Symmetry: C3
Subunit: 284 residues, 3 copies
């Protein structure tokens, strides 16, 4: 069905959270596959299992702890989604994106999204970090959109713009921070295309996706970004290139969630330091 949550449902969850923690984060971070380690840098951390939070869905995917963690990251108060929800789990987008609106009602102003992704751009290598400059919402083309149904004007407008989805200032700061890190490999950047999943792409599909102008492919993020932008949140994020997608038929190989998770560990420290540093650049 279309969005089942009323404005009050979001409000109730927000109030519940506010009454269970003294922390008041202005930044929210959604950790994708193999990126749950970001919470490790949090001090004064308070954890809530998704099942404790009224109205919150459940992370069923491996590598998605399913915990909402409040804490200080590089002197900045934040709330992290250690694990997220995906359409392929059977969740409609209005459920997948539930936390984003709750965050808005908590006083959050900035949303950082991260995910594991397959590289479509041939110049990418496993371990690359790609700053998301733009996206292509394939499910959206068919009408599968978290905003489908009556519009809640207390959140945003009926026809929100998406061309400026990823904050220009933050991406600039992101590049500056990367340089301060003295990293060898250049900070990649590009377009992230989202598809439903859960199966991995065929060679024909990959070629098509690259030809559409996509740099990385995944099964998440985009719906959260759309909902964030609809309610006025500043958004920025990145994809951890966990694998090079098979672009030629029978080229000895096939993607697997194992390599995805395993990759998240080698580049864990990398993006973990990066995100912590970015906290300082996030305004307010």
């Amino acid at each position: 069905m279309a969005n089942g949550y009323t404005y009050e449902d979001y409000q109730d969850t927000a109030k519940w959270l506010l009454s269970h923690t003294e922390q008041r984060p202005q930044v929210a971070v959604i950790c994708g596959s193999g990126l749950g380690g970001l919470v490790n840098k949090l001090t004064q951390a308070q954890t809530f299992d998704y099942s404790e939070i009224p109205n919150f869905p459940e992370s069923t995917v491996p590598g998605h702890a399913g915990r909402l963690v409040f804490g200080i990251l590089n002197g900045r108060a934040c709330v992290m989604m250690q694990g997220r929800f995906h359409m392929y789990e059977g969740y409609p987008f209005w459920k997948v994106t539930f936390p984003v609106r709750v965050f808005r009602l908590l006083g959050v102003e900035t949303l950082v999204v991260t995910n594991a992704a397959g590289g479509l751009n041939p110049n990418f290598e496993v371990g690359d970090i790609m700053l998301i400059r733009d996206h292509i919402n394939l499910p959206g083309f068919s009408g599968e959109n978290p905003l489908r149904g009556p519009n809640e004007e207390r959140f945003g407008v009926r026809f929100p713009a998406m061309s400026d989805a990823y904050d220009r200032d933050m991406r600039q700061k992101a590049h500056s921070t990367w340089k301060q890190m003295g990293e060898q490999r250049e900070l990649q950047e590009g377009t992230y295309v989202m598809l439903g999943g859960p199966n991995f792409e065929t060679v024909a599909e990959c070629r098509l996706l690259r030809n559409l102008g996509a740099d990385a492919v995944g099964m998440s993020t985009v719906p959260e970004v759309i909902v964030a932008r609809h309610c006025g949140l500043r958004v920025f994020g990145f994809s951890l290139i966990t694998n090079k997608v098979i672009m030629d038929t029978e080229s000895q190989g096939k993607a697997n969630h194992e390599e995805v998770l395993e990759a998240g560990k080698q580049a864990a420290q990398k993006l973990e330091q990066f995100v912590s540093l970015l906290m300082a650049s996030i305004p307010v």
Copy 2:
């Protein structure tokens, strides 16, 4: 769920309409965003709010009055949908397209569809009128189709052809009429691509859509055309180019429903005269 309306549901609504008006139009016109002024030229006009008509859905979008108006346009009896329904409102296509089949059961033979659209073809300018020569149904690729489910043979066949959707004769007459109007700007023509919405497209999505061979993009029309063709209605229509879609990242701008509606006013008189004149060209 799949189509919930039985053949009788359509019949009941048709009979209700026939018993409440003496008018018997052979032409139906669906007015899109900012095009509700077309009813203004109607004489002997009788209006029914969608909420009065048994089984009729509700227009919730601004600029969509939500009234079915019967009247004479240029000496021709017609029924106009002052406002339409969209998938992004939460309506499945079988609800969005309900009126089209009712029109068929009223004796209507021709359907004129109009809409506001973003220009993908760089040669288009705001205020341009694009005769729809063909379409690309993105939601249809995924199976979201008003014809999905058991086929009602009393309406049409199981596998209807769409390659000849837009009547060739009418488009020719349309061009001739435009010339008689002595209009400075040439009558544009092209392919209309439909996507779900309600958010506006990203730059990457726009580039992709243009590359797919689309001339204009919108969130309506196509489902009505498919249903019309399935039940044997002659179809023709056009898009009012209300805005030039941002084709380059951060090129100082973003689409908005306001500019869309505001544009519909400047080009209102334009397409209003055009449609009135086309009445004479519609056969029978």
Copy 3:
């Protein structure tokens, strides 16, 4: 809703079948539009109407007999789906693909899929047989996938690979068999793209599909292949090019299910002999 069948539902149907036939096929064949004649070569044939089989959906499309036939084809025991299910019938993919998992639970190891398809590659001619080398799942891009929802690990993994969907060895054997047949026309090969239907494509849509790298277009097969691969079945199949899709606007013509079915008859004997011979090449 997401998959409604529990593991037990599949098991119950499998046990029912095993207790009603002594046959134990290791190969399953799904016959598409106009290909129901393949059962004619079966000896020791036992037929079950889909309506007799607990949990089985119903074939509503003409040319789809709706019978599950057990028998010997070229000395090899097989089970054939004389007719299949399609999304456009109103069936969610978890219902369309129900038989594939039942086959797995019957001891089946190989799945042969066949279908009628429109040719996108200009080199194809009506009557051509195209070995499916790869596919493009458009509905999958939007999330419409038979695997959507909680994953049944007793069938397969959460994120199955699809790049190797069509068995390389079988396609090689397929080509060898074709040569032994002394056929004049070369055995075609390519990518099959699936879309929802039930309407036939517009010219713009066709151009787009070809540009995406598709060789043939249809409204089936892909979901069955995904489910087959998820549960470990060896898969291979082909499309009977029943028509050349209109690639140019108003080029005197339009597709129809009649020509589709009529074509299946001329090339019936052709692919019928071909499939029977392939039985010998299928391993185990």
